[model samples]
Target: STNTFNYATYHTLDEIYDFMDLLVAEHPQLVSKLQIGRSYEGRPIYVLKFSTGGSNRPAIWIDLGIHSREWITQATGVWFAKKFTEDYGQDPSFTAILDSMDIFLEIVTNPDGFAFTHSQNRLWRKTRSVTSSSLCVGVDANRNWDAGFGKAGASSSPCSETYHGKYANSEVEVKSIVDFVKDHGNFKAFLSIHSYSQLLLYPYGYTTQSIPDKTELNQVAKSAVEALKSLYGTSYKYGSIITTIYQASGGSIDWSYNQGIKYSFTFELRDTGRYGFLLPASQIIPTAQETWLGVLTIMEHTL
Candidate 1:
């Protein structure tokens, strides 16, 4: 049973995929697994849809583990999947959020790279795609979006970890989500989850141009962070991506916001750097709990 499965520990790609199936089977009404597309290595990319019943109710999109090295994000996502089911009818706030909106969760955003992290390198951070002309084996999927693609924040060299790839949507993993979201055409919020930095950021990472809704987004982030802090006293900095982290071009939230998703955010989770990508399993539930509050806070605001 999924109840017995340890959400605290890191899981292999197969385990997570199986977990998705189990959740859909257990909660047939609220959960359904949708295979968005395939990875470069031919593994299925899936997203879990959680909804009550609607033709096209406003939705929220959440994706984790784009950089496979961030095992914590994937672990957190797994916990979140289970939490959604457990809380839907039990927690009034979460119940109301689901009653009015839908959630699409991609637990393992980089399936190929995630598998590679377990079998080969633990810190591998890109999509496993081969370029015949270059020796590099992967491209940074996070840097392959259409927003300010191939800009200063991303690398052009094939060997660079932040390589933006040959062109926008070059990697199928990213293209898949782009297609799904565009097809849905009803998403109100887009949240991309990452790790190793305690920050909640909004858009325009590719450039310094200020986003119009900066003030509202900033306040939402602040409230979300406050909700998260109430759990473990964890502190988080909130701001735009370029100002908070760095000038990251082609980020998912940037593209989502540009597409008219008003509430867009990127959450860099867990310890600042003591653990980095190697955060311990003991903190998984705590991290997920706090993140849920932050995310739920944002969802409440979305309503």
Candidate 2:
């Protein structure tokens, strides 16, 4: 493909991966694609790095499609990539942010589940990994991380939707990213994007104790959502993961926060579940635009 992204609709795994190549080819200086790992079905797990010549500087991490059916996140991710290319010299704040810090975005975090959602079950929500003892073909990648692992909020059954893996970082897809960030040790912000809840959640998904920087994160999330709401008047609730939503152990934000990433958040983008996982293609661009404002808010604070 020619890196001409169709932001008006959802896309298949092949098209998304090809978009990655096109993006890197198109913006060689600002964008580069990295194969961090492979999916259970052996699809390459790619992350795009956007920078203005920063090597080991403090970075921001944003991942989407961890839950395959949440198409808006991955779609927004492609839009984010395009936005970075366009907004660098155009927007002073975003330009300054990129000038100082690198942004690493994993456009599709669960390739197997994403592909399966297109071909088989349209609502698949996990990595396609077979458990030796059970017939279940996947593990919830969000619940496969290393924070509060196997705790109260997750399910023990392999077939359950919220099933944690056999161990923390058990899924290769999750572990690969974990290991990559760990190796760098310079990641300051982590954003895991999901959908349908319209929430901007931060930290403590596995506990009730407040993070030391809760006040700062809360205020920033408030501003971020406000910036988001300014675009389409879309409302979003923000708070700790447990209180605003339910307790969800082994989540990516929790794991990243516990790993010393202070500005960890889970962005539940667009809709209050009217269309649910099947959010209309028409809303894709609006959602992506609003989310860019929200994410830019967070990135500005991080910088």
Candidate 3:
């Protein structure tokens, strides 16, 4: 039931999956779930589409929990889903955004890995896909994208956390969304949510070459971070991945930006590593609450 909504705790894969159905049932006109593809272990990868009305309108894409151990991202994803139902007309800025563009929210981008994280290793960061020869179970899904594959920041070893997979778009989990977005071809903003660094980052993770719309993206990132901080006084740094965080290649944001999604962003949500991946369950509500501010700021700009 959607009767007792809990954002202050982490949920299992089944609970999150079930929550998607409840949300859609409650708001049938606004929310619909799409089964884009299956995970390596045969769990469905679901994407939630929120729209008021329109055909081929510019849209925003948000995916969370690509890295399984980052539980906060999935928590934030669930909170964001519920928030969409609550804030549509109540929040004018968000209402304006929904009026113009559809929002595609992928709550669980890697369900099998996420399930394994809960049941086996809490530190696991990759999709649970086995290699032909190597015993390692998975590849880092974020680093398995087409952008800057096999570069300095990633690894060739299957055991590495940042392994870029056998090739770009090799993971069916990543490729399903690629096919969906590419086939739709009207997405203008793509936001990938992760956790524990508290940074709002932009594209060009593959190389030092500046993106053509750097100024506009930088300004929007600045505004988004500032808006995020307005709630609970949480602060976040904003910049490119290469400069702000690392030179991580084959990242989702880099691939999306290269595909001409103008407002592609990656948010490293909450904390400077006091808790890291083991962030306490108590922080879920506040993190999601403040993070939505930044997300809405970006969405407003997209509109």
Candidate 4:
């Protein structure tokens, strides 16, 4: 069944919560589920920190489900959590990696939007906050970061898909993540996962110009994508955000880079928009399995 914990699939927020409950109960030593903040709709924004090591070690920050429609991203993050703990002892490689690193997984970055998508709109893509002057609700959390701070490639219109916030960190969900990064200042790498593009993208997403760590970032991303291809033959584009995709201002990858994480990437996963954000449950395992290869490559290189 798709609802089973062995495979990550849940039809509702309650189902996801139940899975999380079971996960934390079964793996208390490696996983601690905590609420970081509350969404506009009052859904709790949770972060699961999974590590077999101490906090003094440099941490890796991974966020998923920033866009409501990207359900696969959340599933993948949850899958990673389970894989790390379940395979650590059996897989000496993963065990050694976990024993040395602290991994923070923020599975539902935009909880309100995610719940809305599950219950109301199947294609919803933003947070579920309301603006004072308009009836339009929600802002694209990825586009609400402070690095480039509302430049072009994002819209001021609330109804636009890539709407910049009323102001930077206007969305509590984005603010919560920003605060987490600030608190954990020693984060060495940051990964924000999304779906339907199959791209390994680095910063500066705000402009067409190259970032200071462009060479290192590109090298790491290329290596990861190549490893992913070797494992599953999934073709993935790799480059700076502006060059590879578009000049997307205020993106999470750019913000993380600005916040001192040298290796920051945004992974757009699976199917290259064939199934788009609505990728079915049947494709979840393969998508996550291949993505894990790329993730492990990056972690090993970074470590």
Candidate 5:
């Protein structure tokens, strides 16, 4: 009765909570829950920190499930935690990586939205914050950051898909991540996972202007993509956000890179919208496994 492989397909919020509870119960050392803030709906935004050592080491921040409908993002994060803990002793690559670095994997950055996507609307993309003027109850977290706030490729209208909020860090979810990054200034790299685009994107999502660290950013992004291609022959495009995807303001990657993280990326994971956000549960393992290889490659290079 347990949907282990493609758990997202059948698991309810309670079921997912149970799985997370069991994971923490079994692997207390590697996985610790940190409550960052409360959602508009009063659900706690729980961040799971996955680190081998204590807090003294430089941290790598990995966030998933920012966009509610991208269930694979959250799934990959939880899978990464399991892989790190389960394979730490058996695999030298994982062992060495874990022993040398601190990795923080936030499984669900927008828990309320994720839960809503599962239970209420399968296509939900934003948070559930109800504004007084409009019944449209959500903001695009990616476009709601402080950097270049309310700029192009983002919508000011609440009904639009890429709506920037009324103000920066307006959503509790955004505040949670922003505060976490501020507290952990030693974060060497920051990655926010999304779905349906085969891309390894870098900063300056707001404009066509090249990032100050474009050279180093392209080098690291190329390395990551090449490592991924070697695993499954999946070719990934690596470039600035404006050039490769589109121009957007207040994206998490741009904001993180501006905050001094050497390598900040927004990974658009899997299938190139062949299945769109409805990526089936069957592909979760292969997709996550392959993506983890690229992640390890990046970590190895960064460390």
Candidate 6:
């Protein structure tokens, strides 16, 4: 039952999957589930679709838990799913957005890695895909994108945490998203959520070259950070990914922007690394609550 699923606590992979089913059952009119593809370990990848009554409406894509051990992202994604159900007809701004746009939310982007984090390692950050030539397992899903693939900020060694994989979209998890977005071709905004550092970043992580839309994107990031801080006083820094965080090639936002999605963003959520990946469960609700404001800010702009 959706009522019994606890959004304030971390859950196992199975629990999350079950929650998705319950949620769809509870809100069939506004929610439905789509199986995009399968993980390396053969787990079905799912994306929740939230739409009122429009065919091929312009969409917003939000994905979390790409780095499995970043448990907070997945937890916050769950809260986001529930919040969407609750706020649709009750909150004016949210209702307005939903009425005009469709939202594609992939709560667990790396299902294999997420299962590993719960069962074997608490800090696994890659897809559980193996290579025949080496004993190492998994590739950094974030770095498996086509945006400057195999460039700096990514590793070639299979054992390295940030391995870029054999080629762009090498990991099935990453490929699934690429194919989906390319097929839809109507996505206006794409947001990838991660954790540990509180930052809202835009595109061009591969090179020092400037993006043409930097000024407007920077202002949107600034507005998002400000809205996020309004709840619980959680401060955040905002800028381009390379400038704000580091030089990270093959990041999702860069790929999304290159696909003509103007409002592509990546959120590095919560705490300045005191707890890191092992953030306390007590802070889940507060973190998600504040994050909703930031996400909503971006969605408003997308509208």
lDDT of 1 by residue, 1-303 (tens): 789999989999999999999999999999999999999989999999999997899999999999999999999999999999999999999999999999999999999999999999999999999977998889999999999998889998888999999999999999999999999999999999999889999998999999999989999999999999999999999999999999988889999999999999999999899999999999999999999999999999999
Looking at model 5, which ten-residue stretch has the lowest summed lDDT?
A: 1-10
Would you give me the overall lDDT of model 6? Answer: 0.94
Compared with the true structure, all predictions reach lDDT values of 0.95, 0.91, 0.92, 0.84, 0.81, 0.94
Which digits, one per residue and each the tens of the lDDT, describe model 6 over residues 1-303?
A: 777788889998889999999999999999999999999999999999999988899999999999999999999999999999999999999999999999999999999999999889999999999877999999999999999998998999999999999999999999999999999989999999999899999998998888999989989999999999998989999988898899998999999999999999999998889998999999999999999999999999999
> What does candidate 2's lDDT look like per residue over 156-255, in tens digits?
9999988898999989889989989998899999999999789999998989999899999999999999999999999999999999999989999999
TM-score between candidate 4 and the true structure:
0.95
TM-score of each: 0.99, 0.98, 0.98, 0.95, 0.94, 0.99
Question: What lDDT score goes with residue 185 in model 1?
Answer: 93
Q: Write down the worst ten-residue block by lDDT for model 1.
A: 131-140
Q: Over 4 Å off in model 2, which ranges?
A: 1-4
Give the per-residue lDDT of model 5 (tens digit) for 197-228.
Answer: 88999888898888888887788889888888
Clashes per model (N, Cα, C within 3 A): 0, 0, 0, 0, 0, 0
Q: What is the lDDT, from 0 to 100, of the residue 85 in candidate 6?
A: 95
Q: Which pairs clash inside model 5?
A: none
Task: Specify the highest-lDDT model's number.
Answer: 1
Encode model 3's per-residue lDDT on 192-281: one tens digit a residue.
Answer: 999879999999888988899999999999999999999899989999999999899899999999899999999999788999999999
Cα RMSD of all models vs. native, in order, equals: 0.7, 1.1, 0.8, 1.8, 2.1, 0.7
